[PDB]
Amino acid sequence: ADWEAAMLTLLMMLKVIEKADNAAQVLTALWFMALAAEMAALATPPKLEDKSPASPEMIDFRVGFEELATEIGKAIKLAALGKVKEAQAAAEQLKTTVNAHWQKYRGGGAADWEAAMLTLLMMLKVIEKADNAAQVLTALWFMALAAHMAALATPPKLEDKSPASPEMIDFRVGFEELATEIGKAIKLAALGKVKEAQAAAEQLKTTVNAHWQKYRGGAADWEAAMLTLLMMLKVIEKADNAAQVLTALWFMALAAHMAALATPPKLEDKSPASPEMIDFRVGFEELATEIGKAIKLAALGKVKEAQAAAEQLKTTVNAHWQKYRS
Numbered sequence: 001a002d003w004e005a006a007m008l009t010l011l012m013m014l015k016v017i018e019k020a021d022n023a024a025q026v027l028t029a030l031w032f033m034a035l036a037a038e039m040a041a042l043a044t045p046p047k048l049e050d051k052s053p054a055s056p057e058m059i060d061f062r063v064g065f066e067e068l069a070t071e072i073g074k075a076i077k078l079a080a081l082g083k084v085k086e087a088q089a090a091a092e093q094l095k096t097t098v099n100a101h102w103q104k105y106r107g108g109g110a111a112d113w114e115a116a117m118l119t120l121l122m123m124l125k126v127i128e129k130a131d132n133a134a135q136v137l138t139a140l141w142f143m144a145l146a147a148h149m150a151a152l153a154t155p156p157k158l159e160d161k162s163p164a165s166p167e168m169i170d171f172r173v174g175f176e177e178l179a180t181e182i183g184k185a186i187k188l189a190a191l192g193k194v195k196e197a198q199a200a201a202e203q204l205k206t207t208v209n210a211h212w213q214k215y216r217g218g219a220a221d222w223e224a225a226m227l228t229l230l231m232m233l234k235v236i237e238k239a240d241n242a243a244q245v246l247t248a249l250w251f252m253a254l255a256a257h258m259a260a261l262a263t264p265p266k267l268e269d270k271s272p273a274s275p276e277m278i279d280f281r282v283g284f285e286e287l288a289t290e291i292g293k294a295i296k297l298a299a300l301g302k303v304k305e306a307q308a309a310a311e312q313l314k315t316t317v318n319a320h321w322q323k324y325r326s
């Protein structure tokens with residue numbers, strides 16, 4: 001993505017974290033912080049545009065940025081355990097790292113199992129008390145978010161094991177089954193099936209509870225993500241504060257990331273080397289690129305200039321969704 005867009009996303013999310021009351025809104029914003037760090041992992045500040053990836057200056061930028069991702073995860077588990085005030089206290093130390101990292105590269109002119117599992121459970125709580133299709137979709141995407149950030153994680157009772165020993169291997173299938181269920185529930189929440197999606201979340205917490213209890217201690221479909229992009233665009237234009245523009249745009253970048261290797265229902269009989277599928281790859285990369293440019297406008301505070309870019313963004317998702325609509 002764009003380094004300035006994510007760093008100002010971190011700063012704006014740290015700002016809404018201090019203005020939060022319960023642990024859920026601290027957890028969601030902290031996950032939006034981990035979201036901005038993931039999509040801007042391979043980014044590059046405008047100060048370092050002419051340096052090399054092996055340069056010491058750029059090397060320090062990489063670990064200094066992973067220190068930020070590590071600190072975001074530590075604050076997420078504090079927000080996952082319910083320690084709402086110890087998590088907001090960790091956000092205070094988080095702002096010191098974000099500010100010092102931002103200034104050093106200023107424009108010029110997570111991975112914890114128990115945090116995501118407690119996020120999945122807490123997101124299952126916010127799904128059961130959902131009104132419309134928007135919040136169940138966002139919560140289900142936060143579930144796909146937590147499963148993506150804890151992909152290579154490890155339960156506390158299995159770090160000593162072996163990524164080849166079936167005990168850890170059995171943990172890998174049971175967790176990919178979880179991301180599979182989350183994606184199937186998003187597909188129902190995307191098609192407007194509000195009650196059928198919450199019914200899918202019922203059996204989903206069955207998988208979550210059986211998985212969490214087995215390791216406690218002592219994704220995305222193309223049409224599901226495209227309907228998410230289209231639905232998030234509905235939320236963008238019916239809002240007027242930069243944060244909810246930014247959150248919806250990050251859900252758009254979220255939906256484009258989880259369905260990066262996806263395939264429309266019309267194109268699975270083709271090959272990943274046939275140009276009909278190759279045009280689908282660049283055409284989808286054009287979409288994630290436009291979403292990043294609109295986040296930059298929403299991160300700089302330009303609430304309108306970002307919403308203006310969202311209308312032109314809808315022109316791109318509509319032409320893309322129709323050409324692979326079946």
Ligand SMILES: [Zn+2]
Pocket residue numbers: 038148257
């Ligand atoms: Zn990712």
